[PDB]
């Protein structure tokens, strides 16, 4: 999870979802391309409160 | 089942619901595109059938 | 819950099954530490060995 | 759920203190009545959330 964070596929409607990156293959729904994306965070000022 | 030209499956316990199930056998495993039988479980979210 | 439980100690209607994982607040079973603790033993045990 | 055992120390333990945080505020929150100015959503309005 160091690399890959939490994989996208369907928890609960809260659960947030970076521990802390956020990952999952999508498979582009234009067309038949099946790709792998992954988003990282940095909080910032006063994200904690 | 030889008999009837059944297979039947049998599970202790699931790791979560809201993935969908099916049953896969394989000789190779590790490769899906190998398998040589694929069931969807009939009512999802069920064992032994 | 206590309705769901108390139905289930007799019958075993599933009506609607999966209960909509979005429909929890409720708290989590937790593992037993005495076992846990003889695994943990066990492991030390086999590093210093 | 009856197979989503977690390790102890988590705030999802039926046991953690997450638990029994849960079960005093559950029997002490009508303790008093709301029109009074002891009553515990009246005095820390933030406890409720």
Same mark, same amino acid.
């Given at each position: 999870? =160091?690399?890959?964070?939490?994989?996208?596929?369907?928890?609960?409607? $809260?659960? $947030?979802?970076?521990?802390?990156?956020?990952?999952?293959?999508?498979?582009?729904?234009?067309? $038949?391309?099946?790709?792998?994306? =992954?988003?990282?965070?940095?909080?910032?000022?006063?994200?904690? =409160? | 089942?030889?008999?009837?030209?059944?297979?039947?499956?049998?599970?202790?316990?699931?790791?979560?619901?809201?993935?969908?199930?099916?049953?896969?056998?394989?000789?190779?495993?590790?490769?899906?595109?190998?398998?040589?039988?694929?069931?969807?479980?009939?009512?999802?979210?069920?064992?032994?059938? | #819950?206590?309705?769901?439980?108390?139905? %289930?100690? !007799?019958?075993?209607?599933?009506? @609607?099954?999966?209960?909509? @994982?979005?429909?929890?607040? %409720?708290? %989590?079973?937790? #593992? @037993?530490?005495?076992?846990?603790?003889?695994?943990?033993?066990? !492991? %030390?045990?086999?590093?210093?060995? | 759920?009856?197979?989503?055992?977690?390790?102890? &120390?988590?705030?999802?333990?039926?046991?953690?203190?997450? &638990?029994? /945080?849960?079960? /005093?505020?559950?029997?002490?929150?009508? /303790? *008093?009545?709301?029109?009074?100015?002891? *009553? /515990?959503?009246?005095?820390?309005?933030?406890?409720?959330?």
């Amino acid at each position: 999870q =160091k690399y890959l964070g939490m994989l996208q596929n369907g928890y609960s409607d $809260s659960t $947030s979802a970076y521990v802390d990156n956020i990952s999952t293959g999508l498979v582009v729904n234009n067309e $038949s391309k099946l790709e792998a994306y =992954k988003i990282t965070r940095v909080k910032t000022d006063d994200y904690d =409160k | 089942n030889k008999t009837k030209n059944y297979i039947a499956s049998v599970q202790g316990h699931l790791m979560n619901a809201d993935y969908t199930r099916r049953l896969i056998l394989t000789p190779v495993e590790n490769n899906y595109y190998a398998r040589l039988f694929e069931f969807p479980f009939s009512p999802n979210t069920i064992l032994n059938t | #819950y206590q309705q769901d439980l108390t139905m %289930l100690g !007799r019958g075993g209607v599933s009506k @609607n099954l999966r209960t909509a @994982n979005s429909l929890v607040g %409720l708290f %989590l079973p937790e #593992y @037993n530490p005495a076992l846990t603790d003889y695994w943990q033993t066990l !492991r %030390l045990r086999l590093f210093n060995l | 759920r009856s197979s989503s055992f977690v390790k102890p &120390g988590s705030v999802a333990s039926m046991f953690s203190p997450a &638990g029994y /945080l849960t079960e /005093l505020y559950r029997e002490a929150k009508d /303790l *008093h009545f709301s029109s009074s100015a002891y *009553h /515990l959503d009246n005095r820390r309005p933030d406890l409720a959330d």
